[PDB]
Ligand binder design. Structure first.
Ligand SMILES: CC(C)CC(=O)Nc1ccc(-c2nc3ccccc3c(=O)[nH]2)cc1
Ligand SMILES: [Zn+2]
Length: 208
């Protein structure tokens, strides 16, 4: 039931999604090993993901969470990178999309930094890089990220350098405690708590 609608680059909505992508790139402690070496992207396409069943699944869960948290869903727009973004946009998020070995347990992980999500496009740790050239820093191959609407509800704060949410919480927030420039990462434990709103197709750009 999924339709993808291309946004025009002239559309304010294209522009605001692109700005969130570009503005949340940071350097990574791996020197670019997982995600590649870059400071910015070449955005090739931004598509709106339209699926009525999946949207209704999300909004149902959002109301459940809101009612458990003083009418506050604590909804964010966050990035998600995975080799399975094509499955997600058709079928939704579920346990097959969980990072079993994540530092906050087996859940579905999202990032404020688009470049953090970029590290997972080709698998955990970047896998073996792009399928065509086996290059984690490939500047040629098209990559895709999701920019997702995520319900955090009451989030458990973890200060740090499918399972269940911590009791009394709907998510976990991984707060950076060493790298002063890193943004937060978030984990949900129910696929219904995220909707894959935008599919972004892009390349990383080689620094000059
Ligand atoms: C079959 C197996 C490989 C499933 C899996 O672990 N997939 C997986 C998908 C996405 C991510 C992921 N992990 C993150 C961790 C922190 C911040 C963002 C992300 C993010 O955008 N994606 C990790 C693992
Ligand atoms: Zn490549």
């Amino acid at each position: 039931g999924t339709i993808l609608i291309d946004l025009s680059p002239d559309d304010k909505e294209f522009q605001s999604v692109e700005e969130e992508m570009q503005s949340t790139v940071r350097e990574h402690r791996d020197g670019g090993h997982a995600g590649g070496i870059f400071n910015r992207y070449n955005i090739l396409k931004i598509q709106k993901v339209c699926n009525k069943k999946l949207w209704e699944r999300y909004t149902h869960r959002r109301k459940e969470v809101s009612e458990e948290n003083h009418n506050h869903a604590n909804e964010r727009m966050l990035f998600h990178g995975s080799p399975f973004v094509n499955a997600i946009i058709h079928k939704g998020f579920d346990e097959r999309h969980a990072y079993i070995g994540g530092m906050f347990g087996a859940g579905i992980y999202f990032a404020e930094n688009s470049s953090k999500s970029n590290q997972y496009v080709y698998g955990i740790g970047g896998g073996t890089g792009c399928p065509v050239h086996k290059d984690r820093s490939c500047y040629i191959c098209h990559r895709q990220l999701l920019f997702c609407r995520v319900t955090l509800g009451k989030s458990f704060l973890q200060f740090s350098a499918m399972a269940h949410s911590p009791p009394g919480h709907h998510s976990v927030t991984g707060r950076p405690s060493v790298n002063g420039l890193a943004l937060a990462e978030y984990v949900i434990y129910r696929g219904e708590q995220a909707y894959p709103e935008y599919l972004i197709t892009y390349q990383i750009m080689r620094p000059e």
